[PDB]
Amino acid sequence: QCTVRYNVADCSHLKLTHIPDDLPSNITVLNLTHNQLRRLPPTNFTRYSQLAILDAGFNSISKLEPELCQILPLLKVLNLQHNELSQISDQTFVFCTNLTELDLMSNSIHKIKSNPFKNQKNLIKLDLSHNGLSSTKLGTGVQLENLQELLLAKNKILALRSEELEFLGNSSLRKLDLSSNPLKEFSPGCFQTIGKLFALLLNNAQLNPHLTEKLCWELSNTSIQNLSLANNQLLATSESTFSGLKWTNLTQLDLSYNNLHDVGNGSFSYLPSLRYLSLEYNNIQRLSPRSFYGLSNLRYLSLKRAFTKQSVSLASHPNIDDFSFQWLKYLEYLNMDDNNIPSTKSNTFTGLVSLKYLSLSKTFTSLQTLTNETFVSLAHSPLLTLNLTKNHISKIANGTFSWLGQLRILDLGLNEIEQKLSGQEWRGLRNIFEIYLSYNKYLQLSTSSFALVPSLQRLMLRRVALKNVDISPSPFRPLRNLTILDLSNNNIANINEDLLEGLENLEILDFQHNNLARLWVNFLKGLSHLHILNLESNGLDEIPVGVFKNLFELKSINLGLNNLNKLEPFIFDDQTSLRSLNLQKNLITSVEKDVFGPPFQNLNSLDMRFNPFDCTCESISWFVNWINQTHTNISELSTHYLCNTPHHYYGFPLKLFDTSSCK
Ligand SMILES: *[C@H]1O[C@H](CO)[C@@H](O[C@H]2O[C@H](CO)[C@@H](O[C@H]3O[C@H](CO[C@H]4O[C@H](CO)[C@@H](O)[C@H](O)[C@@H]4O)[C@@H](O)[C@H](O[C@@H]4O[C@H](CO)[C@@H](O)[C@H](O)[C@@H]4O)[C@@H]3O)[C@H](O)[C@H]2NC(C)=O)[C@H](O)[C@H]1NC(C)=O
Ligand SMILES: *[C@H]1O[C@H](CO[C@H]2O[C@@H](C)[C@@H](O)[C@@H](O)[C@@H]2O)[C@@H](O[C@H]2O[C@H](CO)[C@@H](O[C@@H]3O[C@H](CO)[C@@H](O)[C@H](O)[C@@H]3O)[C@H](O)[C@H]2NC(C)=O)[C@H](O)[C@H]1NC(C)=O
Ligand SMILES: *[C@@H]1O[C@H](CO[C@H]2O[C@@H](C)[C@@H](O)[C@@H](O)[C@@H]2O)[C@@H](O[C@@H]2O[C@H](CO)[C@@H](O)[C@H](O)[C@H]2NC(C)=O)[C@H](O)[C@H]1NC(C)=O
Ligand SMILES: *[C@@H]1O[C@H](CO)[C@@H](O[C@@H]2O[C@H](CO)[C@@H](O)[C@H](O)[C@H]2NC(C)=O)[C@H](O)[C@H]1NC(C)=O
């Protein structure tokens, strides 16, 4: 039966057929979702006349009794989605007044007569989607004074009369949704009849260029701001297409998923108030210097997947030409992901003088080499972020970035870079904060590799194969303010121990899968801000005393997947703030207190399973006792902590080891 938390009585997937009484009378909620109820007799609700929100979505309800509302005088949100209600009457919701949200989302209510919501002078959001409606008309007089969000998507409405919307004579609508209706015409004045219209959703309504043109006329001279037209048949645009919007202060426009092939010249010259524009998922063939004329106030532009695709046969690629964005002088964000553009041009980005975030992931096809001229079109953009993942880049040249003097994030991962870093690629990055090089072919380092980027703070070199790493002074030496150094899966041939000297601000160090055992001293020298340290998978099997001396800030240490067994007492003497310890899949035999006491003191989480535990009081008594009385999190205790010796204890669960009989 029903479970009852704070003031709410949840009875969701039980397959009920009756309304339960066991529940409190001090509840102001009641989730009867997803059951089997015939209907909701206006009498069985007395016990909880405190019901603030009755949620009976997804049942078999057929009719609603008028008395229900009055028997429940504090019903604010009623939900009857996906029920079986037939037709609403003039007398049904006649009592519900404190109502703020009514949802009749899925009841196949084909027709509406009279004024069924005359008294809902408080209803803030009405939902009548997915029925059989063929008219927007819900009344005869100016009613629903306070309505704010009318949802009527997924119906069968073919026309917007001026007559069938006047009941909103003075209703400040924030959102009218008519998505998924087969609109064949918009009569004159249809959208004017509303008090105020702010946001309109006409997705997936089968609109084409002409009907969209007549749509924008009917929108002239209304307070609309968000207009969404995604997923229609708007194959091309003219200057006349959006002209009717010059008489509006439109702000946001969605034009994705329309199969848009050709943006006419000046298709947007009457949108000087637009800030957000989406062109995602389309087939733009060309962008010319005239394409975005008029968008002098634009801020966010997404052209992700907005171009001509690959196609099965012909090698087709869009053609954006110099200056296409020369008018977007207030733009700060530009997403150009997932497209088949060949490369940049010496003036591709010119005019974007307020740009900050430029995304170019999986954007280019014919690049592969970056040169001193590739990004010259941004020499005048205050860029902070540059994404270049997935472009098949293989070489970066001297001075490539000298233009982006104000960059902070640089992302060159998932590429095929293959070269030696003389240090001159970064020439000019005065403010760079993070550089991402993970998932590349190979980088040959040098004494100067990062000499010109001292402001750096985060550097990732995962899965890259590093050459020339045992060189003094270390290649990481100039990075005094470095805080994250994630370089794993490189398997470095020789690691001189000078590495990492001077990284006083280092907080995270990732050195996994780098066969660190061979070269092995005292790696971690003065890294007293180290918090997270991962040395997983290095074939380690005899770790020195002193490598953790003075790392008082360690919160997690991961030495899993090595060959550790014998540990010198006091190694973890300084790790008393440790929250997490993982030595899983090692060769540990004993778990003594002179080694594991300190760290265990405050540990929130421990992972030490898959180890040849020796079941003898000398090896585990202290351990097994500690395990019984600690609040620490140990997972899979009962099954993945088994004893290995002696004979009689092969595979016996550690936690079951009797300790009483010990001394
Ligand atoms: C510039 O542009 C790049 C391209 O869009 C963008 O790349 C990525 O952006 C984010 C940030 O990493 C990724 O978001 C998520 O997916 C990543 C991998 O998750 C995997 O697993 C989930 C779960 O099954 C799948 O849904 C998913 O498809 C994938 O298989 C990953 O980044 C992240 O997941 C993980 O989070 C953990 C947090 O505790 C990590 O340990 C773990 O290592 C992993 O990061 C996240 O959920 C995008 O997937 C990725 N974009 C794509 C589509 O390739 C760059 O971030 C952006 N560059 C920057 C840094 O500005
Ligand atoms: C760019 O990348 C490398 C660095 O060049 C930069 O050095 C700065 C100190 C600064 O003066 C910048 O103006 C300059 O661009 C450079 O590396 C190779 O070429 C260097 C010549 O600049 C080589 O230096 C050596 O210099 C001695 C001096 O006489 C000379 O005899 C010797 O032959 C050699 O040239 C350096 O050894 C080179 N590094 C290696 C081995 O790769 C790149 O050439 C520059 N890129 C290009 C091709 O433009
Ligand atoms: C589009 O242009 C302006 C937008 O400016 C108005 O926007 C309002 C939402 C409000 O927050 C404020 O920014 C400003 O009132 C509208 O012009 C305004 O119209 C009102 C009433 O007619 C006047 O009293 C204002 O003075 C006037 N601003 C100016 C300086 O002309 C304009 O009405 C609007 N057009 C449409 C079709 O909505
Ligand atoms: C948009 O306008 C530009 C000019 O700003 C057009 O440029 C020329 O258009 C004519 C007519 O097709 C042809 O000469 C060339 O296609 C273009 N050459 C020159 C001189 O620039 C451009 O073609 C127009 N493109 C559209 C309709 O998207």
Ligand SMILES: *[C@@H]1O[C@H](CO)[C@@H](O[C@H]2O[C@H](CO)[C@@H](O)[C@H](O)[C@H]2NC(C)=O)[C@H](O)[C@H]1NC(C)=O
């Ligand atoms: C129009 O566009 C979006 C709706 O998703 C909203 O625009 C912006 O401001 C909102 C705050 O009112 C934020 O919640 C949005 O995240 C933000 N948009 C961006 C770029 O992410 C705005 O609410 C919408 N107007 C409506 C629906 O009335």
Ligand SMILES: *[C@@H]1O[C@H](CO)[C@@H](O[C@H]2O[C@H](CO)[C@@H](O)[C@H](O)[C@H]2NC(C)=O)[C@H](O)[C@H]1NC(C)=O
């Ligand atoms: C990249 O570096 C500069 C920046 O554009 C280019 O121009 C300089 O080098 C040229 C030799 O190729 C000289 O002819 C130019 O005069 C010189 N700039 C000056 C000082 O006026 C250079 O060509 C580019 N080199 C490459 C391709 O890496």
Ligand SMILES: *[C@H]1O[C@H](CO)[C@@H](O[C@@H]2O[C@H](CO)[C@@H](O)[C@H](O)[C@H]2NC(C)=O)[C@H](O)[C@H]1NC(C)=O
């Ligand atoms: C690395 O970190 C230090 C933080 O102390 C940076 O110094 C700061 O920034 C400027 C120097 O450009 C100083 O005038 C400020 O007083 C410092 N405080 C901060 C954080 O605002 C130092 O510059 C950084 N390394 C670089 C980029 O050289």
Ligand SMILES: *[C@@H]1O[C@H](CO)[C@@H](O)[C@H](O)[C@H]1NC(C)=O
């Ligand atoms: C309402 O209460 C009466 C009490 O006799 C009960 O018989 C009836 O089944 C209840 N209604 C339903 C079907 O929930």
Ligand SMILES: *[C@@H]1O[C@H](CO)[C@@H](O)[C@H](O)[C@H]1NC(C)=O
């Ligand atoms: C909107 O509210 C009522 C509708 O019943 C109307 O009489 C009134 O004139 C309108 N608001 C104004 C302008 O007073």
Ligand SMILES: *[C@@H]1O[C@H](CO)[C@@H](O)[C@H](O)[C@H]1NC(C)=O
């Ligand atoms: C691990 O589980 C125990 C449950 O007894 C919990 O009390 C402890 O807080 C958990 N560890 C964490 C998340 O700190």
Ligand SMILES: *[C@H]1O[C@H](CO)[C@@H](O)[C@H](O)[C@H]1NC(C)=O
């Ligand atoms: C746990 O084991 C200890 C011995 O270390 C014993 O005293 C205690 O009763 C046990 N309690 C359980 C079953 O958790």
Ligand SMILES: C[C@@H]1O[C@@H](O)[C@@H](O)[C@H](O)[C@@H]1O
């Ligand atoms: C070459 C083109 O010529 C006209 O069409 C101008 O209106 C454009 O701005 C462009 O300069």
